[PDB]
């Protein structure tokens, strides 16, 4: 009853959305878009199966690209230290196996068996990859079915099986060279090709722009972290409160309104027109991406119907990457 009272008090506040955005990743300094993306990824989206029997994905993938020395890995470490189910992996260390189902001979047995991997232990959870670029091409294509189909099919030695890995993958990548090139396009900066980029729900490029005021603020904050230890960090919501509130929201299953459907169609048309006669950055996935983001945003406010405002906010989040 007391926890329920606290939960309803949490919901009652009309500034919940920005409060959660501020609370996420308290150690890092003022990265609102990335924190919003992490929150929406944590909430997730509704997964559905049509009358067909084919499954529509309901998870969200986010890739944060930035120059070295920026606050990329801090977000990943926070997610690993906060999410219910999650694992941490490195691009160079990870291989095709381990990141997927592996076939190893049974202990005290002559028969082969399937050993879980990073994408299996993180079922219904968030998986973190620190250096996406450093991963080999052979290993990169390993996570192609798990990203969209959400299933892993292996036909190795007498082990014909079709496993399921319904995991959300969050990764951090460096540019092709040393620093992000403003002139070159996103695909130009990253060695990742069209399919992988299309699979990813969002892209958050972080630029270490130079400014006196924000430089002073960042220096003061980072020095305060080392001087005052933890008391210098004051999230609006404690970790336990945040993990309770997130748990509450995930039970809701929002639905779409008619005007919201028409508005979403209009925004997809706008995105396709903007990309312009092929579309390298926008595919049919992006429509489902907007749907998932809108559903997650509706979950964040604890409502069971998506108003056009949530769709507009999701479009703003998606358009930012371009």
């Amino acid at each position: 009853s007391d926890e329920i009272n606290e939960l309803k008090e949490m919901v009652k506040d009309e500034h919940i959305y920005d409060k959660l955005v501020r609370s996420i990743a308290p150690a890092v300094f003022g990265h609102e878009a990335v924190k919003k993306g992490i929150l929406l990824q944590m909430l997730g989206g509704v997964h559905k199966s049509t009358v067909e029997g084919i499954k529509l994905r309901g998870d969200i993938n986010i890739c944060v690209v930035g120059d070295p020395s920026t606050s990329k890995s801090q977000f990943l470490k926070y997610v690993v230290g906060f999410a219910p189910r999650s694992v941490y992996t490195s691009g160079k260390a990870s291989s095709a196996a381990g990141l997927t189902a592996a076939v190893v001979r049974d202990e005290e047995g002559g028969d082969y068996t399937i050993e879980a991997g990073a994408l299996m232990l993180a079922d219904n959870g968030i998986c973190c990859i620190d250096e996406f670029d450093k991963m080999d091409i052979s290993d990169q294509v390993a996570i192609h079915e798990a990203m969209e189909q959400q299933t892993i099919s292996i036909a190795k030695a007498g082990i014909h099986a079709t496993l399921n890995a319904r995991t959300s993958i969050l990764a951090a990548a460096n540019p092709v060279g040393g620093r992000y090139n403003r002139k070159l396009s996103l695909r130009g900066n990253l060695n990742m090709t069209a399919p992988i980029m299309s699979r990813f729900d969002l892209f958050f490029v972080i630029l270490d722009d130079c400014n006196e005021k924000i430089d002073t603020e960042l220096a003061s904050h980072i020095v305060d972290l080392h001087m005052k230890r933890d008391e210098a960090i004051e999230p609006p919501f404690s970790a336990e409160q945040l993990r309770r509130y997130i748990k509450y929201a995930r039970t809701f299953k929002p639905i779409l309104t008619k005007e919201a459907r028409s508005y979403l169609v209009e925004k997809y048309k706008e995105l396709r027109k903007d990309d312009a006669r092929s579309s390298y950055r926008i595919t049919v996935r992006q429509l489902e991406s907007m749907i998932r983001l809108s559903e997650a945003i509706a979950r964040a406010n604890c409502v069971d119907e998506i108003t056009p405002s949530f769709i507009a906010e999701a479009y703003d989040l998606l358009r930012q990457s371009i």
């Binding site: 559905k48 049509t50 014909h160 069209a194 699979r199 006669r277 092929s278």
Partner: protein, 442 residues
């Protein structure tokens, strides 16, 4: 004796499966084969085993299930039909445009890509294998290669046909190997003599072998499939068990062009890394292209959003649920899926259409024109393999009507399919001339 293991899905997240040994006595032997989902009702017995006591160090007893009945895992089988149903299929086949309904009723949740639907339906229905005095063998399977831009509803269609097909095996390019595609050797615990397992291709004989991310497979694995594509048999030599296995299955492959996108200017040769032989072996090559158009994108967005809203989890009691499910199914499909699943099996089982008499000169003229216009550089020569594919697709199309007479309409439609498949694969510069020359057929 068989080894029963827990279903991978039922196992909690990332836990080891648990296995037992089941003993089948008289009247139950050879009732199941590896790779089946079964339900076993029997007596759970135990007995003293000295080896277990010596190993573990405690008085533990071995346990095994003495089977009393084995069943496969609505009813018993959807593919099975009754005499009453066989009368319904004949009535439906009498429909003037049944073929169009079958094509439309296939993957309705996907809006566009009608050429994909036609090709995949033809592959599912299959052809009629032919033998001539034991001297000439003609394959009846139809192979379809899917190629196009990243987001085009490619893998989902393969997943759908996996469910629809009677005996289907799904393998991904990355997660596959030749040993798992041909066979694996085991040691029999009783006779201690090496036996031989079945492979992915073998398990899908007289069915379909779906391959996703085909371009990602290694060269050796891609050679392992050359034999099954044309020879329709796999040869094995391991542990002195030299023998030949039967593999007569159709292959549907999906891949994305080399470099991540299809450059319409360049030909299909450079676009995909597959070698000329395998490319030739494919019958229908439905190249997919993702362009930008206002009206098409509006329609696609409307359909996708309607599909998403229609399938929301929120949107006798069992009979009412079935009735609403049927309402939606008829909403997107002119023919119910359940009827189509049995229709495919019945057509593949009981009907073997044959060519009685038909004006050869039509297809001969089409072949001559194809060769005349294919001499242009950058176009693969039109070998007789295209003429064979025309006949195979004609037989499959006639199978749709459950008619043992291949009429003219089916042959012209097959000509259209093959001509369009060839035309789309070529470059733009040659595409203009090819489209100009071919008007009656397309």
């Amino acid at each position: 004796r068989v080894t029963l293991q827990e279903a991978p899905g039922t196992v909690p997240p990332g836990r080891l499966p648990r296995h037992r040994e089941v003993i089948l006595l008289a009247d139950l032997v050879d009732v199941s084969k590896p790779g089946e989902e079964v339900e076993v009702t029997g007596i759970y017995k135990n007995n003293y085993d000295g080896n277990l006591n010596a190993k573990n160090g405690f008085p533990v007893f071995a346990t095994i299930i003495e089977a009393n009945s084995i069943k496969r895992r609505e009813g018993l089988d959807v593919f099975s039909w009754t005499e009453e149903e066989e009368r319904e299929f004949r009535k439906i086949s009498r429909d003037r445009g049944i073929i169009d309904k079958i094509i439309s009723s296939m993957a309705p949740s996907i809006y566009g890509h009608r050429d994909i639907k036609t090709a995949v339906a033809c592959s599912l229905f299959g052809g009629v294998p032919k033998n001539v005095n034991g001297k000439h063998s003609i394959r009846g399977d139809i192979n379809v290669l899917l190629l196009g831009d990243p987001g085009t509803a490619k893998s989902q269609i393969l997943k759908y046909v996996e469910k629809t097909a009677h005996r289907a095996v799904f393998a991904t390019g990355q997660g596959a190997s030749a040993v798992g595609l041909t066979a694996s050797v085991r040691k029999d615990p009783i006779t201690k003599e090496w036996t031989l397992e079945g492979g992915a291709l073998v398990l899908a004989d007289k069915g379909v072998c779906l391959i996703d991310e085909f371009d990602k497979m290694n060269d050796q694995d891609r050679t392992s499939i050359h034999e099954a594509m044309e020879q329709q048999s796999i040869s094995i030599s391991k542990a002195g068990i030299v023998t030949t296995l039967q593999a007569r299955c159709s292959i549907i492959a999906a891949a994305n062009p080399n470099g991540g996108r299809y450059n319409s200017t360049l030909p299909l040769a450079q676009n995909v890394s597959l070698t000329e032989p395998i490319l030739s072996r494919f019958d229908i090559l439905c190249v997919v292209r993702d362009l930008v158009d206002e009206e098409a994108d509006e329609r696609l967005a409307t359909f996708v959003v309607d599909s998403h809203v229609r399938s929301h989890p929120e949107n006798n009691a069992r009979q009412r649920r079935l009735q609403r499910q049927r309402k939606k199914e008829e909403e997107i499909s002119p023919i119910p899926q359940e009827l189509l699943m049995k229709y495919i099996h019945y057509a593949r089982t009981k009907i073997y259409p044959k060519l009685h008499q038909m004006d050869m000169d039509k297809v001969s003229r089409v072949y001559a024109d194809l060769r005349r216009e294919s001499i242009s550089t950058g176009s693969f020569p039109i070998t007789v393999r295209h003429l064979e594919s025309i006949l195979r697709i004609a037989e499959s199309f006639a199978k749709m009507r459950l008619s043992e007479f291949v009429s003219s309409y089916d042959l012209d439609r097959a000509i259209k399919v093959v001509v369009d498949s060839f035309v789309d694969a070529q470059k733009v510069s040659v595409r203009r001339q090819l489209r100009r020359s071919f008007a009656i057929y397309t």
